[model samples]
Target: SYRVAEDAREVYDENGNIINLTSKEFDLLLLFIHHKGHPYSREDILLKVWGHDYFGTDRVVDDLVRRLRRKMPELKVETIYGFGYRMM
Candidate 1:
């Protein structure tokens, strides 16, 4: 199992070791962990992670998710058809 410590701003793997997560990665993972099983659109993710004031392209979210998946393969993050993602 994985553990996300929001207060400490850290993520622990099954071995109980800290995983190296960037600030954006941490925020992305934390958001998914908090809203597991809930599918959020790409726009929603962008709004939440990058913030309402962010004007970057939506592709950034996809790139971030790809990186997050590669780092934590244990996570069950699903891509919703024509939508966004959901973590289980």
Candidate 2:
């Protein structure tokens, strides 16, 4: 399991080792973990993490998720084909 320290904006693996993450990466991870098993469309994620003023493409969400997955291999984030992603 993973432990999140929201106050410090940090994540720790099951072994109690800190996992380095960028700001956006942390935001995305927090969203999925907080709402575990809840599905979120790319657009919804963009709005939630990047804010309403961000005009970037939704594909950025995919890239961000990819990076997050790479960094935290133990995370169980599932991709809903043609729709979105959910943490299991």
For all predicted structures, in order, the TM-scores are 0.89, 0.92
Model 2 residue 29 distance off true place after TM-score fit, in angstroms? 1.0
Stretch of 10 with least lDDT, candidate 2: 51-60
Reference-based TM-score, model 1: 0.89
Across residues 1-88, which tens digit of lDDT does each residue of candidate 1 receive? 7888888888889899888788899899987988879989999999888898988788899999999998899999999878888998
Q: Which residue segments of model 2 deviate by more than 4 Å?
A: none
Backbone Cα, N, C clashes tallied per candidate = 0, 0
lDDT of each: 0.89, 0.91
RMSD per candidate (Å) reads 1.2, 1.1
* lDDT for each residue of candidate 2 in 1-88, tens digit (9 for 90 to 100): 7888888989899999998899999999989988989999998899988998998678899999999999899999999987889999
Clashes of 2: 0
Give the per-residue Cα lDDT of candidate 2 at 10: 90
